[PDB]
PDB file of C-alpha atoms and ligand atoms in Angstrom:
ATOM      1  CA  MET A   1      12.877 -15.398  73.951  1.00 29.93           C
ATOM      2  CA  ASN A   2      12.411 -12.641  76.542  1.00 31.90           C
ATOM      3  CA  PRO A   3      13.640  -9.059  76.042  1.00 30.15           C
ATOM      4  CA  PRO A   4      15.176  -7.421  79.155  1.00 32.03           C
ATOM      5  CA  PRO A   5      12.570  -6.140  81.545  1.00 28.11           C
ATOM      6  CA  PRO A   6      11.804  -2.564  81.566  1.00 28.82           C
ATOM      7  CA  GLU A   7      14.357  -0.523  83.482  1.00 30.30           C
ATOM      8  CA  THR A   8      13.916   0.268  87.169  1.00 30.57           C
ATOM      9  CA  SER A   9      16.996   2.484  87.416  1.00 31.23           C
ATOM     10  CA  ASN A  10      18.420   5.082  85.108  1.00 33.10           C
ATOM     11  CA  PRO A  11      21.193   7.223  86.744  1.00 33.97           C
ATOM     12  CA  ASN A  12      20.814  10.123  84.259  1.00 35.70           C
ATOM     13  CA  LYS A  13      17.046  10.409  84.714  1.00 37.11           C
ATOM     14  CA  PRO A  14      15.758  13.107  87.088  1.00 38.33           C
ATOM     15  CA  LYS A  15      13.756  11.691  89.848  1.00 40.71           C
ATOM     16  CA  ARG A  16      11.165  12.863  92.503  1.00 42.45           C
ATOM     17  CA  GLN A  17       9.380  11.901  95.727  1.00 47.78           C
ATOM     18  CA  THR A  18       5.877  13.391  96.135  1.00 50.67           C
ATOM     19  CA  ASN A  19       3.128  12.646  98.636  1.00 52.23           C
ATOM     20  CA  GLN A  20       1.116  11.448  95.596  1.00 51.55           C
ATOM     21  CA  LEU A  21       3.831   9.059  94.488  1.00 52.25           C
ATOM     22  CA  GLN A  22       4.195   7.858  97.982  1.00 52.76           C
ATOM     23  CA  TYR A  23       0.438   7.128  98.008  1.00 55.03           C
ATOM     24  CA  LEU A  24       0.706   5.396  94.755  1.00 56.15           C
ATOM     25  CA  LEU A  25       3.124   2.854  96.471  1.00 56.58           C
ATOM     26  CA  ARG A  26       1.588   2.567  99.853  1.00 59.07           C
ATOM     27  CA  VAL A  27      -1.979   2.540  98.889  1.00 61.01           C
ATOM     28  CA  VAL A  28      -2.603   1.790  95.214  1.00 60.65           C
ATOM     29  CA  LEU A  29       0.100  -0.473  94.306  1.00 60.98           C
ATOM     30  CA  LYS A  30       0.226  -2.427  97.616  1.00 62.73           C
ATOM     31  CA  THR A  31      -3.440  -2.829  97.761  1.00 66.33           C
ATOM     32  CA  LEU A  32      -3.986  -3.886  94.189  1.00 66.38           C
ATOM     33  CA  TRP A  33      -1.062  -6.323  94.818  1.00 64.73           C
ATOM     34  CA  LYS A  34      -3.251  -8.277  97.163  1.00 64.85           C
ATOM     35  CA  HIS A  35      -6.235  -8.639  95.003  1.00 61.94           C
ATOM     36  CA  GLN A  36      -7.137 -12.190  94.047  1.00 63.35           C
ATOM     37  CA  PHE A  37      -6.697 -11.095  90.179  1.00 64.08           C
ATOM     38  CA  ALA A  38      -3.340  -9.563  90.753  1.00 66.98           C
ATOM     39  CA  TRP A  39      -1.045 -12.585  90.226  1.00 65.12           C
ATOM     40  CA  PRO A  40      -0.614 -12.490  86.532  1.00 64.83           C
ATOM     41  CA  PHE A  41       0.358  -8.810  86.757  1.00 66.79           C
ATOM     42  CA  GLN A  42       3.073  -9.057  89.541  1.00 64.27           C
ATOM     43  CA  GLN A  43       6.133  -9.727  87.248  1.00 65.25           C
ATOM     44  CA  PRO A  44       7.003  -9.092  83.694  1.00 63.20           C
ATOM     45  CA  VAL A  45       5.432 -11.638  81.258  1.00 64.92           C
ATOM     46  CA  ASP A  46       7.915 -14.561  80.820  1.00 62.73           C
ATOM     47  CA  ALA A  47       7.189 -15.769  77.228  1.00 68.06           C
ATOM     48  CA  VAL A  48       9.572 -18.758  77.698  1.00 69.59           C
ATOM     49  CA  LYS A  49       7.699 -19.918  80.748  1.00 72.42           C
ATOM     50  CA  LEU A  50       4.243 -19.315  79.270  1.00 71.41           C
ATOM     51  CA  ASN A  51       5.113 -20.688  75.775  1.00 69.75           C
ATOM     52  CA  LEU A  52       4.032 -17.305  74.142  1.00 66.23           C
ATOM     53  CA  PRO A  53       6.580 -16.831  71.256  1.00 67.86           C
ATOM     54  CA  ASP A  54       4.501 -13.909  69.880  1.00 65.99           C
ATOM     55  CA  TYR A  55       3.759 -12.064  73.218  1.00 64.93           C
ATOM     56  CA  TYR A  56       6.552  -9.657  72.479  1.00 64.49           C
ATOM     57  CA  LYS A  57       6.219  -9.689  68.792  1.00 66.03           C
ATOM     58  CA  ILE A  58       2.841  -7.955  69.709  1.00 62.36           C
ATOM     59  CA  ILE A  59       3.646  -6.093  72.777  1.00 65.21           C
ATOM     60  CA  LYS A  60       6.388  -3.415  72.432  1.00 67.28           C
ATOM     61  CA  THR A  61       5.895  -1.470  75.667  1.00 71.58           C
ATOM     62  CA  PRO A  62       5.551  -4.205  78.242  1.00 71.87           C
ATOM     63  CA  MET A  63       4.745  -3.329  81.788  1.00 70.35           C
ATOM     64  CA  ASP A  64       3.737  -4.974  84.847  1.00 69.99           C
ATOM     65  CA  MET A  65       3.208  -4.205  88.737  1.00 70.01           C
ATOM     66  CA  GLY A  66       6.565  -5.832  89.761  1.00 70.55           C
ATOM     67  CA  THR A  67       8.287  -3.156  87.607  1.00 70.97           C
ATOM     68  CA  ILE A  68       6.031  -0.498  88.971  1.00 72.68           C
ATOM     69  CA  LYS A  69       6.770  -1.353  92.536  1.00 71.62           C
ATOM     70  CA  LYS A  70      10.366  -1.288  91.909  1.00 71.10           C
ATOM     71  CA  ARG A  71      10.165   2.001  90.140  1.00 68.44           C
ATOM     72  CA  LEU A  72       8.256   3.509  93.058  1.00 71.10           C
ATOM     73  CA  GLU A  73      10.820   2.015  95.527  1.00 69.67           C
ATOM     74  CA  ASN A  74      13.605   3.559  93.501  1.00 70.63           C
ATOM     75  CA  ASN A  75      11.901   6.881  93.103  1.00 71.00           C
ATOM     76  CA  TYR A  76      12.148   6.406  89.363  1.00 75.44           C
ATOM     77  CA  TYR A  77       9.275   8.692  88.444  1.00 73.26           C
ATOM     78  CA  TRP A  78       9.174  12.386  88.158  1.00 71.36           C
ATOM     79  CA  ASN A  79       5.263  12.546  89.010  1.00 66.59           C
ATOM     80  CA  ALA A  80       2.206  10.635  89.757  1.00 66.07           C
ATOM     81  CA  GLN A  81       0.928  10.850  86.196  1.00 66.54           C
ATOM     82  CA  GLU A  82       4.053   9.016  84.897  1.00 68.35           C
ATOM     83  CA  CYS A  83       3.388   6.136  87.261  1.00 68.00           C
ATOM     84  CA  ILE A  84      -0.469   6.082  86.397  1.00 67.71           C
ATOM     85  CA  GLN A  85       0.577   5.834  82.734  1.00 69.85           C
ATOM     86  CA  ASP A  86       2.450   2.719  83.455  1.00 72.73           C
ATOM     87  CA  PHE A  87      -0.628   1.030  85.142  1.00 72.70           C
ATOM     88  CA  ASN A  88      -2.594   2.194  82.021  1.00 71.45           C
ATOM     89  CA  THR A  89      -0.065   0.507  79.808  1.00 73.51           C
ATOM     90  CA  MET A  90      -0.087  -2.822  81.628  1.00 71.07           C
ATOM     91  CA  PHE A  91      -3.865  -2.894  81.348  1.00 71.73           C
ATOM     92  CA  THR A  92      -4.083  -1.974  77.583  1.00 69.31           C
ATOM     93  CA  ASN A  93      -1.250  -4.496  76.836  1.00 70.57           C
ATOM     94  CA  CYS A  94      -3.531  -7.196  78.260  1.00 73.10           C
ATOM     95  CA  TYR A  95      -6.322  -6.275  75.989  1.00 73.62           C
ATOM     96  CA  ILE A  96      -4.191  -5.881  73.057  1.00 73.70           C
ATOM     97  CA  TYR A  97      -2.693  -9.389  73.443  1.00 72.55           C
ATOM     98  CA  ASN A  98      -5.793 -11.275  74.454  1.00 72.05           C
ATOM     99  CA  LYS A  99      -9.586 -11.248  73.469  1.00 68.67           C
ATOM    100  CA  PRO A 100     -12.741  -9.886  74.921  1.00 72.76           C
ATOM    101  CA  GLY A 101     -14.184 -12.232  77.582  1.00 71.45           C
ATOM    102  CA  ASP A 102     -10.938 -14.056  78.124  1.00 70.73           C
ATOM    103  CA  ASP A 103     -10.278 -14.925  81.811  1.00 70.78           C
ATOM    104  CA  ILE A 104      -7.095 -12.669  81.719  1.00 68.84           C
ATOM    105  CA  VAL A 105      -9.246  -9.815  80.420  1.00 68.70           C
ATOM    106  CA  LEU A 106     -11.928 -10.089  82.965  1.00 67.62           C
ATOM    107  CA  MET A 107      -9.082  -9.944  85.600  1.00 66.60           C
ATOM    108  CA  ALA A 108      -7.663  -6.723  84.103  1.00 68.72           C
ATOM    109  CA  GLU A 109     -11.019  -5.267  83.906  1.00 65.23           C
ATOM    110  CA  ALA A 110     -11.634  -5.685  87.497  1.00 64.77           C
ATOM    111  CA  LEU A 111      -8.239  -4.492  88.554  1.00 63.75           C
ATOM    112  CA  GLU A 112      -8.593  -1.390  86.243  1.00 61.02           C
ATOM    113  CA  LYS A 113     -11.949  -0.307  87.975  1.00 64.68           C
ATOM    114  CA  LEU A 114     -10.371  -0.851  91.407  1.00 68.41           C
ATOM    115  CA  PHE A 115      -7.325   1.115  90.231  1.00 66.26           C
ATOM    116  CA  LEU A 116      -9.560   4.029  89.040  1.00 65.08           C
ATOM    117  CA  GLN A 117     -11.257   3.981  92.439  1.00 68.78           C
ATOM    118  CA  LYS A 118      -8.061   4.334  94.201  1.00 68.01           C
ATOM    119  CA  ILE A 119      -6.808   7.135  91.840  1.00 68.47           C
ATOM    120  CA  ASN A 120      -9.951   9.071  92.868  1.00 67.96           C
ATOM    121  CA  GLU A 121      -8.580   9.226  96.522  1.00 69.09           C
ATOM    122  CA  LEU A 122      -5.052  10.540  95.577  1.00 68.81           C
ATOM    123  CA  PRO A 123      -4.192  13.232  98.011  1.00 65.30           C
TER     124      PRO A 123
HETATM  125  C1  YNS B   1      -3.554 -20.115  80.350  1.00 63.78           C
HETATM  126  C2  YNS B   1      -3.572 -18.809  81.241  1.00 63.78           C
HETATM  127  C3  YNS B   1      -4.639 -18.167  81.589  1.00 63.78           C
HETATM  128  C4  YNS B   1      -4.649 -17.109  82.411  1.00 63.78           C
HETATM  129  C5  YNS B   1      -5.705 -16.214  82.843  1.00 63.78           C
HETATM  130  C6  YNS B   1      -3.334 -16.755  83.117  1.00 63.78           C
HETATM  131  C7  YNS B   1      -2.253 -17.451  82.669  1.00 63.78           C
HETATM  132  N1  YNS B   1      -0.743 -17.175  83.395  1.00 63.78           N
HETATM  133  C8  YNS B   1      -0.360 -15.852  83.234  1.00 63.78           C
HETATM  134  C9  YNS B   1       0.811 -15.532  83.978  1.00 63.78           C
HETATM  135  C10 YNS B   1       1.486 -14.212  83.866  1.00 63.78           C
HETATM  136  C11 YNS B   1       0.925 -13.471  82.859  1.00 63.78           C
HETATM  137  C12 YNS B   1      -0.164 -13.796  82.122  1.00 63.78           C
HETATM  138  C13 YNS B   1      -0.827 -12.903  81.050  1.00 63.78           C
HETATM  139  C14 YNS B   1      -0.779 -11.426  81.022  1.00 63.78           C
HETATM  140  C15 YNS B   1      -0.247 -10.423  82.134  1.00 63.78           C
HETATM  141  N2  YNS B   1      -1.390 -11.056  79.811  1.00 63.78           N
HETATM  142  N3  YNS B   1      -1.843 -12.226  79.233  1.00 63.78           N
HETATM  143  N4  YNS B   1      -1.362 -13.340  80.005  1.00 63.78           N
HETATM  144  C16 YNS B   1      -1.645 -14.637  79.372  1.00 63.78           C
HETATM  145  C17 YNS B   1      -1.139 -14.824  77.996  1.00 63.78           C
HETATM  146  C18 YNS B   1      -1.441 -16.219  77.453  1.00 63.78           C
HETATM  147  N5  YNS B   1      -2.959 -16.646  77.558  1.00 63.78           N
HETATM  148  C19 YNS B   1      -3.769 -17.186  76.452  1.00 63.78           C
HETATM  149  N6  YNS B   1      -4.965 -17.455  76.818  1.00 63.78           N
HETATM  150  N7  YNS B   1      -3.215 -17.473  75.172  1.00 63.78           N
HETATM  151  C20 YNS B   1      -3.345 -16.327  79.063  1.00 63.78           C
HETATM  152  C21 YNS B   1      -2.967 -14.829  79.516  1.00 63.78           C
HETATM  153  N8  YNS B   1      -0.806 -15.045  82.394  1.00 63.78           N
HETATM  154  C22 YNS B   1      -2.322 -18.610  81.772  1.00 63.78           C
END
């Protein structure tokens, strides 16, 4: 079964809007979203759909770009580093669950390099 997806709202959490967070949504997230390798990462891993009973047995801090996008739209984050950490968790989860050379790992490796390129242009 699927655990609940990561929260995208938390009324007691303190929140911020910064120019860097705006850029993370407008440029980083929305450009990576359009990449030809982005599709596996656009929503939480659905272990029922994918017949993956051990995905959430192995991955304890799941993360995906749909969650990140919703978090940015809801101003969920305090700073850009907190959002950047979610991207890094998404990529590392993919390496943890899969194997070197797998198609999904090649996709994450390409997306991670593009992500780092865009982070260098943070205002
Ligand atoms: C057979 C296949 C290959 C590929 C490249 C993608 C898919 N579809 C999707 C859709 C949404 C998320 C994922 C995903 C993420 C994120 N992280 N891992 N995955 C899977 C886990 C199981 N898996 C395996 N080889 N046991 C493949 C990679 N994959 C299915």
